[model samples]
Target: MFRSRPNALSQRSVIASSSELASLAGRDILKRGGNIFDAALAVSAMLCVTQNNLCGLGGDLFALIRDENGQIMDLNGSGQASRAVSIDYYESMGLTKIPERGPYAAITVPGIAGSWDEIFRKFATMDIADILEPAIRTASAGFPITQNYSDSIARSAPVIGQYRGWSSIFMPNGSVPVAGEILKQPDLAESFRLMSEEGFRSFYDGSLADIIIAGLEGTGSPLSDRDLRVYRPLIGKPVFTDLDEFRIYETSPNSQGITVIEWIRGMESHGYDSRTMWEAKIEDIFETMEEAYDKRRKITDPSYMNGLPKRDHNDIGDTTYFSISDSEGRSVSIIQSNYMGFGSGIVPKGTGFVLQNRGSYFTLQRDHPNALMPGKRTFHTLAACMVEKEHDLYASLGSMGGDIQPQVQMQILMEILKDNTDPQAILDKPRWTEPYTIYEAPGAVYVESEELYRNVSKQISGRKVVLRDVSQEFGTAQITTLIRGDVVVGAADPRGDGIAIPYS
Candidate 1:
């Protein structure tokens, strides 16, 4: 996926998947007389249709925006559990953790629509419909299947085909489409059109809402129109810290962003940049992550967990991150997701969008903090980090792994800040993360491809590396930075066919 020579560019630099969404957004912004924020919003809207498996209008969003003056702002676009959800409700059902499936039970009030509305309100100077026009057109006219899209569909066919709505949209003939084939979704196009014409409320409060409510009600779920009506995105302050000459920033509590900062601080205490320090740093990060996650379990909502100190319930799905910077020195790092792939796997018919299952992150323990509660925000895996050096923004970096995201991001950041490597070189190096404690054995390490094993020590018997080719689970990333004087560099991860385009 890494081409040696740089691709030709027009006026602005934009990078995304091979899909036209990113380019469309970049070009759209320039045409509409907008800025980087406008391009990001437009591109994200298009990605909903083009990269349907990862994000959509039906998902949630989290962002770290760097203003023109370098001040950082955090946007929490994640949704909350329905008011109908209660610890007693799940405890009465004899459930300990929320089920991974079951549309009714998995449902949460989706927050991406609200996120889009707020982003447009705060930073975008254009109308929502105008920003979404490209995506609407593409979905209606149809686009070719990208290799990433094709591979994901093929790999997930068995699981996706099992769901009625998923199967209907992804596999009409009971088979996944081949690469380069034309993929079309007229229904999705119409949905985008409605969103463009009438704004987010058209989906949240209009016909789209009816379909979602009906789907949940028919399935015996607790979601209602009230939950949809009340959902709003929170604009909060970003956590900030400095590492030597570099200033780091991320989302505050309730997100693993703090964990990223903590891991970096831990590594700094141990001199992580030393050549022989890999194992020690890795182990330290793993231990710290475990402790942080344990503390996170105690956090549900400050309002509901009365006995627990408000200071305790801090730091906590599935999230994706992307970074952007313009020639004007403005930058943004955004992490967005539905808490799970094809979240809840519940696509309400006629609305042409999948609903998120973020609610499943809740627990049923009544007395324990983080117990399921009405309108409580669940723990999220989403986070983004920005690096600044000498009072100037240097790089924006993030990844997609659930619990492993911060670890992966920390490693990359170390390479860039300490080792003085380019973004591509940092990403090209071997990648590693601790195995999932829920399924894989403890102390095991999951590496990217088997080729990465050559760099690892053979003496580590507990290490188990699973080869996940073309899977975003390894965490796909896009980073753009002003690496040198007058040289703005951007690089996409080679593992998932990432691309970087530049603008002046």
Candidate 2:
């Protein structure tokens, strides 16, 4: 129920991605008559080249896709901790929390390449080589670095350089690459080449598996060849429910997707009052989200926690998100992450890939629902979302932030479907997030609007409500919407180096 027209429109297809280059690549693929599956594959790989700090080949991926047949599916690309690194090992170390940076937290297997292979094999019209070509070429020929990437390097320089292979690439000239610099990740290019030619198995059971395991082992992580060889994405039906005229489908356990659903259920119970809408008061969502997160506390690794509903869905710092829609009215919403900025600061020797610190999220409490254990997936904050109505794709939406992702996503969808607003207005509007994630900034409510901020500040009694400008402080989001079942609207968060490209 937006009051304004959308920021942009496309008659055929549209792609909204965190990086302009990635979005362009998706649009190009669609122009080649590729399906949403093909466009999304290109975008995800391209992000590995352009947004390494936010997402990389060494991270996990989750996606919610709506196919041409009107079927909805979810893919859980998250990896488990290496069986070699167990709760007993950590308990013996006399440590209460997993180290946020270093090899200890980088022990989980990476699942992006594996996910790409499966999803693409079943849906893509183009060859895997062609789908991977853009990323490979970008890595080999160097892509211009973004300011965000430069800023992250500056932030992590002190610790990242401590890792064995980091300085060789990230600080090739004794300093990290600056914005506008032509930075090339030749080794990453070589790895992508291997995958393109030999299939993604090259990173799992094949030859590259040895390189990955050895590099991780050399860096102090307990990862082994057996870990990489046995990994594959966890496939499942999305945790879903009806929201007015739409059905929202999101990831289940291990992912925090259920948080959004819980909040939406709260809204539904109240009959979705217009006054309590986020676009109106903004503060109304604060309580519902706070309540939603309280329930989320129980959802954890299936291997550890039990008795709770099986389908239920953090890391705070870095992730990349994008959405693609094709002319057939099919859309895909995708998200990937490395737990924190420059995750773990552990670069596998000679790989140029910084491993994720997602393991850092495991709880130390022996009886907790999400306690650490051998080969169990940690509590994940990454997820993607999509909306369908009467067999028609309504929207594909998602954002990158720890606990804030669900709220941001909820606000975006509510603004559109609930308020009758357009995608651009939702992207342009100031977002409000409750600071609840353990690894992010201190607890508080961060908002973009000042007057609404002032009003909201007074409503929340104990916690603080701080005003923040639209930058990376808030999570960036992307949306591709079908309005009136015909007009298609696409938008990307301006906070990121993003763009919504129309198919040629």
Candidate 3:
């Protein structure tokens, strides 16, 4: 078998992401004497230009960051449902569920900008303009489209083509641009420029918010001015669990992060560890996935739910993930998403981005914890995490696959904590995923190789296991680990168009 891409090793800093440009941008920040927190914000901003299909300023952000002092901070950048949205509102409209596209689906306020402001205030070292410069230049001058980017545009057209301003930005010529063409978003560049000049809060209460609200006029999005002005990203401690020698941390509620914790705890309880046979491990993990998801169904905004019960753990959605670790042992694992492919398919007049369809995750089932309600955040699949060992930061990692995020994260965690796998080897290994849509039983187990498929099929009795390539459905995972204090190793998934860059 061919070897996967070599892991990038460094004594100073390392950055890994789904987009090479985004990784490079983050590395530039590190070279400029910025810490992981500063680099994280830069990489995130650049991804909006490079991997706009999967994530953008219109999406939500979730992260787990550990500073040199071992203080961990969790960021929940997700937005809430509009005040006008509720079970009664949808029922009165004669709709059984939230529409996945159009105005109503865009009910949640866009939280990325607000989250950026919060990060700038709390952790970032560089000024806003300097931090956002790379993305601004890319959006203004344009970047050559890769096959992955062009293909996404072609695919998204069918889903969001009719929405206002979407085609104008993505399909400038009223058609999908082929690979190698320059994709520019002058309007988005201008938007970023305004945000930098006026302050990040401009997206909510200032000039930029006016433009966004103006664009929201005919879209039927219930996100009013107050919703935007009053919105704030949550910065709190992460929910974590200890598994043997490792302590794992994940983003808190309002996100499906707990699913991973429950899954891993369940695996430990079942006596499955690194010593367990590969086939048996797969079966037990799948079983735990099912159990964790059952609990996930009950997760909602933290304000609405009681405290978590206890230990026990736990898409392909279109999200982007990146990990950055500096020489001081500080690391940041962050993930962001527009939800679904093109989100709600609503592009405000000249915002040059799609508003997220996150609200669509909310159900009309009144008795369920995730049922639609005003100002409530839905059960989110977006999660980022970190692992610590011996009271120090060990690794920063995350994956980008909507509902399957925790599943992929579980597999990665096992390799790191149990098998002690090398960074590249862990990402290179073929994987498996149980595919499913919202509120549905899982389909067959999708495996990358026929051998694994055969092995899983034998062990998984009731669910049909298939030997088919899941492609992006298997997810793209990124990791940056601190080895022996100063040494760092980073790797990006080969399944994605990304690379890990290390700087000394």
Candidate 4:
């Protein structure tokens, strides 16, 4: 009923993202004869500019890619805890938990730039400059802000405005810019220009890295030059699970992408499907989400991912997601985030982006798998997902909403696999998820729309239920499905300021 748009249909290609401009960036690449890989990179870089509130060069990325040969691969572009930080370091500073904002919260070594470099070297057909040109231009020339972008700037202004370099970039003329106002980030453009000229490695071991280090000089960020120089994105096999005829794949550990697969598997284990879900079996859905999310403690850096016990389980993040698929059988599902809006609110001098607070997810408990340590990646809420039927590409999709990602994706997949729902309908459907708390898992189940709340409240007893208006709390998902290996159908979530662009 909330269908704000129709499915974007095409025989050639499609790009669905949280921002129309970012989607256009990818479409432009595809039109220039770039493959899905190149197009995806372009989109990713553009998001760093257009959706900077949610993601940036100072953040992280995770992607699931399907090659023309039908082989699926995952890239974990998540940042790592600085080599200079540990539980002892924090304890010595009399800190019980990492601050959600400011320099200390930015303890992770950003990996998006490194990931971009790797993708460029291995998969891109175009030069780095070509792939990054759109982002550079957008940042330098500026674009009219969307309603969401404006609102985010206003809402976050009071929270992170005082941080170095933050207000200078987001709050021009000493005030938050409103929707339709032209916003420029010349410094960010310069950063992109450096990458375009020197390739993505400039972010890690080149001139850009020097600027970043110099910018962090007085800040409490634990990252060192070595941490930046030695970091590389991990490319590996994606984790997957089979539900009936559909094979669902997700980013590997550290990304928390497995939560979706685990949730589906848990439901299947109980012989539940879309029917049960549609019937508002609140207990089962909540139980499955709880179980799946409980696995997060085990989803640490790969090196620390072995052998973990789980007895109980229970997680705000702002992120961006996009999907691109080409007629040549190449598809990409990518998600990126700065962790929380304006992440840490600390933009390094002249870098024109906020550093992610991803390191804030690390635990101080010494024995915990996600405990803070040198060179360790924290548990991430980001995930990129893909689906296949009989080992062939079926859909490229993903979502943004921090912890709500897996829940939202599970619902979308259920609709697609059980009802064969069209892409637009699938996204238009109302959504529900566990309450929006990160640490404690005990909260009322929140449902969007009065109808869902009524249905769920009627079926459940003794459990709290909250009815909320449709918002990003339910998550924003982008999807592109390939029908019969020819027709590409794409949908951009109505909750986002984006579009599903059909490539002719």
TM-score, cand. 4: 0.95
Clashing pairs in 2: 1-419, 1-420, 1-421, 2-420, 2-421, 252-313, 253-312, 255-313, 314-380, 314-381
Candidate 4 residue lDDT tens string, 294-325: 77547788878762332131127789999887
Q: Clash number for model 3?
A: 8
Tens digits of per-residue lDDT, candidate 3, 1-504, equal 455788898988889999999999988888887777888898999998899899887889998878889998898999887887788888889999888888888888888888888878889998888889999999999999999889888988888888757888888888899999999899889889989999988998898888888988877778788888878888899998886567889999988898888887788788875345233456777788888877777778898997323221114479999998877878888899999876888876777778899888888988877888898888888999898887777888999887788878887887787543377788877888775544666666778888788878787887666565636768989999887756888999987888999987
How do the residues 270-341 of candidate 1 rate in per-residue lDDT, one tens digit apiece? 665333334453455555555544454544443454522222110123445566776456777876776666
lDDT of 2 at 3: 28
Candidate 1 displacement at residue 150 in angstroms: 2.4
Please state the error at residue 490 of candidate 3 in Å.
0.6
Off by over 4 Å in 4: 273-280, 307-315, 419-421, 436-438
lDDT agreement with native, every candidate: 0.67, 0.78, 0.83, 0.83
TM-scores for every candidate against the unseen true structure: 0.87, 0.93, 0.95, 0.95
Candidate 3 or 1, higher lDDT:
3
lDDT string, candidate 2, 1-504, tens digits: 552233557777788888889988887777777777888998999998888878888889999877777776788888888898767788788877778888888878888888887788778899888888888888899987888888878877886677657667777888878899998899888888888888877889876777777766646678888888888888778998886567878888788998888888877676574234554444456767777877888777755656322211112567888988755678888999887866787766656687888888887777777777778888789989887766688788899887778878888877766643367777877777765553233366677889758877687766666777777667889888887646677888878888888774
Model 1 residue 99 CA deviation in Å: 1.9
Q: What lDDT does model 3 reach?
A: 0.83
* Pairwise lDDT winner, candidates 1 and 2: 2
Error of 2 at 248 (Å): 1.6
Clashing pairs in 4: 315-437, 315-438
